[PDB]
Design a protein around this nucleic acid. Structure first.
Lengths: 80, 205, 80, 87
RNA sequence: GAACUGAAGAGUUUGAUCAUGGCUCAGAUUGAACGCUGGCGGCAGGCCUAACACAUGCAAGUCGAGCGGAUGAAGGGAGCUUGCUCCUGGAUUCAGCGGCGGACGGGUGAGUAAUGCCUAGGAAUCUGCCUGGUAGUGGGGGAUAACGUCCGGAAACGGGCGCUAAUACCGCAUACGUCCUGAGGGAGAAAGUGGGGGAUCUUCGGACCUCACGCUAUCAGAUGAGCCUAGGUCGGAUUAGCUAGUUGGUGGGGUAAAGGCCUACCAAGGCGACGAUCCGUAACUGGUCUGAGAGGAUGAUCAGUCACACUGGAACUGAGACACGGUCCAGACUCCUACGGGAGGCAGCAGUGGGGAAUAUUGGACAAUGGGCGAAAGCCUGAUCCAGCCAUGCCGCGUGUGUGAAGAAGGUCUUCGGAUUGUAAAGCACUUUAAGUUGGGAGGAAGGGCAGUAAGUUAAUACCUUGCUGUUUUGACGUUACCAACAGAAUAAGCACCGGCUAACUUCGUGCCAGCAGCCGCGGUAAUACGAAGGGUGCAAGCGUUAAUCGGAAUUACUGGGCGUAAAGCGCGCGUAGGUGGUUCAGCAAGUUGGAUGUGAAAUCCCCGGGCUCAACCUGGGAACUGCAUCCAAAACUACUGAGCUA
RNA sequence: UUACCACGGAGUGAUUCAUGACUGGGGUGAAGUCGUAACAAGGUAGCCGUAGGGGAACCUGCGGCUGGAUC
């Protein structure tokens, strides 16, 4: 299964997530086929909280990728 | 950390008016500035080429109270930033919050400014910054915290700043005790007694 | 379309296969001088025509022996 | 040391290995009956073994015993040999 | 717009000089260790050696909405008057059959010099779960756990005798695809479960419709894996020959797939100074350190690949393994035993013993992000998120601020005048970061349950799915970051050096002794070089020493050195491979040049910004990856081809 | 029951490491014995190759060289 999940790529007590397209068997922060966007839960000023790159998100979704419970909520929030 | 100790020895070793003391009295009436400190202050002996650069290095270090590790990084950032490594150098440590407050005249000396800034008594752009080494930008407003407005130290130093040479690149409002940083000074705006080319050559050794 | 290599043949004492020498010129990484290199490849010859000394051409093709993955295009020059 | 889930899987695989070996043996003998017939050059019983062989080899190929590609290859080689025998 | 801006030398051969030439030093860095010292916080790092052995605890479970049994409540009816017992009821949650997972995630670098890795291509393949499409899920049969009983065994457990279920197993029917085929034909599957329901029938369980989860056949996609080709990948030639399944061919077998992968036969082939084979070492790469660059050294953290799982070997199941916490056998070790036999594999996370100069807690939680199972609730997760210890490193802050001559005392030197410690202290005012106490205080939380509503669907307003509304609930860390108030300078400075290189000097004691020492060297009775004091210098919660790499070293010289005498022209010819080749015309386009395309993983380096009070750190975009492959243009030079000319 | 094959066993080599009575040279030494071989024409010019001899530096022959003094 190819999946769209969040790769924890920030720092201690300051999480940052990469919206990542990858096979479900790979590790969270490990191998992937493509990164498509990112999510900042602690964005304060000019930091963009969520960038999605809506184009490639549909392509992998059309290929059968199954987003996780967090990305699916974030995907709706991006389009809402 | 920081150097804590007698201050004339820093000036006496070099023989230049280091601004470690308030301008209440001239340094000659306070200390024997015509001799280097220590038992053998009356000798002679020409300094080597490397010694002149090192003494030049410590003058910039001792005037602003900076350790070289930051200075070496400040050199690295000055070497990083485009333009001459010469004038990129002095601007970097002229924008320190303690030095800017000293230019604003809130402290008679940079030692007063450092303690006054470190004690959360200064807010720049409305947010309290209690670090000496903050790098202020052009257009930044630096103010004193409202609880610290009645400090006699800034009250005394603001007048002492009058008879010290009015610096052009920053302006201060006496009633609000707040000033704004217009722009970084150029070489002509700082004292020419320094030789910033000795700074670069020494660190190439 | 398909990458075909050219070289001088060197040995034909086998059955239905001929060995072709490939001439290369790779510069030395440091000294930057072209040194002639050798690449002997075991080419397959479904029927035998090529004798020793003929320039021929070969394609990377099906592995059809333990050391034979290349087969002949044609003789471009025959060693008369 | 050993989890109860691993113990169950080993028991499950041993039961399946005995079950699979019987079925895999059935495929092997049925083809073997044909190969013995071609090697004996007995045409009349060649297809009788062959026609008896074709059901079972796909019956276990669909079961996943020998994979369908292997079963397909066996049919072609066996048919070709019997085709070569009928001259 | 930017992705660069970048290069120091000194000491030492001599009576003295120039050159050559080696040695040493000034620098950057480390998973570092040792000595002295020691306040805090953020981020990161933390057995480099014994791939040594492992006590203890956890690290892979989950599904009752697949199945059989047990446990059997709430709620009702009874003798007693509900103490205590008998019936209906099935809410649960459980050992075991089955399904999925266990091949992921995690650890280590032993082996491996190429069946590995890197780059660029190719085709013959397989690919669970996922997505889209297509055709179906029809009807039977025979068993076995669990269960009861018996026997054997110390245990591990094993063996009979009877019973039963399935989405367990196997027949039969059927075939949009699919497999083989003399293209005429032949062959091949499946499984049901839950919710709800308007009619119809019923054995009264249900049949039937719908929804959802499934299962079967097959096509395509995606992911992953397998295979093949060419180039590259440490040192050694005081290692030159190596290889008969060896190298090809033919037939057959075998694999998911080609292939000596295997075999039968035929031929004598195949590799190698362009370094085969052998020996020693070694995981490889992105990258990291250093360097102006070219280069040199290196392969921690993080990421990709590989190999390994106590040693050797082997297969089984499965889509996927020859499988760390699976199976079998052999071996060494540890342990239990009733002596007949059994059990185990921390190079998973903690921890222990041992080795070593040296590297940490027997911690909390699934809150977040992932993973497995499940319809969901939910469970597990030593992945992960956090916390404990360590100046191990980077970064940031503090250990106070101004005034203050009495130039106080004491110490040191003294020319005996004085100087120096020294505005330094004392004193007078002052603030109190950080630490302490108290108080307030985000965010990391997405969601779930319940109820309602709207939409979709279905014959249905029912069930179910999705979007909103209201309520209640989820934070391990944490006693949070962060913010206020109180108090008091109060809780906070040490290390190395002072002859030159190299910034910084006197005195005292010693007297070639003690000792110092990176080199020059110092010390044999007036030592700025030993030990101490004062003074100063540099650095600072760090300071030095060691160990190692690069630089300096143009001291392996491609950039960028030399060979008359300093080391270096073979004793001298000829000549093989190779290297290089006069001049003119034409062609070609491998080199060469320009462009385009694909690739050159992400992270890192670099440039411009953004967020932590700044920085370290994180992150957005760009640049770069100097390479390879293909294509398109060009023909000055090289290479090739053809034709000439005479130097 | 046969084929494959691990452990284990036998023989015979190769290589590498560590040791070994004794023996050979090499280096460093606070300096002892015997000479004085080279450096000046070093008191027989020196050196190179080779051969023989001698306690030792060395000597001698043969060829070669100047990296030899006087002239």
């Amino acid at each position: 299964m190819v999946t769209i999940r969040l790769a924890r790529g920030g720092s201690k007590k300051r999480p940052f997530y990469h919206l990542t397209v990858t096979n479900s068997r790979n590790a969270r922060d490990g191998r992937f086929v493509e990164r498509i966007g990112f999510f900042n839960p602690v964005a304060t000023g000019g930091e963009v909280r969520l960038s999605v790159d809506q184009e490639r998100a549909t392509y992998w979704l059309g290929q059968g990728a199954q987003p996780s419970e967090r990305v699916a909520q974030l995907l709706k929030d991006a389009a809402k | 950390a920081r150097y804590i100790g007698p201050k004339c020895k820093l000036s006496r070793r070099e023989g230049t008016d280091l601004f470690l003391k308030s301008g209440a009295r001239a340094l000659d009436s306070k200390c024997k500035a015509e001799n280097v400190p220590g038992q053998h202050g009356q000798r002679r002996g020409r300094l080597s080429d490397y010694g002149l650069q090192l003494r030049e290095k410590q003058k910039v270090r001792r005037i602003y109270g900076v350790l070289e590790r930051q200075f070496r990084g400040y050199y690295q950032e000055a070497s990083r930033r485009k333009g001459s490594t010469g004038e990129n150098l002095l601007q970097l440590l002229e924008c320190r919050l303690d030095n800017v407050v000293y230019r604003m005249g809130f402290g008679s000396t940079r030692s007063e400014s450092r303690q006054l800034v470190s004690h959360k008594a200064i807010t720049v752009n409305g947010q309290t910054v209690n670090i000496p080494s903050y790098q202020v930008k052009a257009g930044d407003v630096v103010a004193v915290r409202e609880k610290s407005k009645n400090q006699l130290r800034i009250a005394q130093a603001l007048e002492l700043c009058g008879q010290r040479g009015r610096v052009e690149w920053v302006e201060v409002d006496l009633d609000k005790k707040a000033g704004t940083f217009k722009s970084a000074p150029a070489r002509s705006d700082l004292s020419a007694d320094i030789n910033e080319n000795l700074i670069v050559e020494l660190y190439s050794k | 379309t398909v990458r075909t290599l050219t070289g001088r043949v060197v040995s034909d004492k086998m059955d239905k296969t001929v060995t072709v020498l490939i001439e290369r010129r790779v510069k030395h990484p440091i000294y930057g001088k072209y040194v002639k290199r050798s690449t002997k490849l075991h080419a397959h010859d479904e029927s035998n025509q090529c004798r020793i000394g003929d320039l021929v051409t070969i394609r990377e093709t099906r592995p059809l022996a333990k050391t034979k993955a290349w087969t002949l295009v044609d003789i471009v020059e025959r060693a008369v | 040391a050993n989890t109860p889930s691993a113990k169950k899987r080993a028991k499950q695989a041993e039961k399946r290995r005995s079950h699979n070996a019987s079925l895999r043996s059935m495929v092997r003998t049925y083809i073997k009956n044909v190969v013995k017939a071609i090697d004996a050059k007995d045409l009349e019983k060649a297809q009788a073994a062959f026609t008896a062989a074709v059901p079972v080899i796909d019956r276990m190929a669909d079961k996943g015993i020998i994979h369908k590609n292997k079963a397909a290859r066996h049919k072609s080689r066996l048919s070709g040999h019997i085709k070569a025998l009928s001259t």
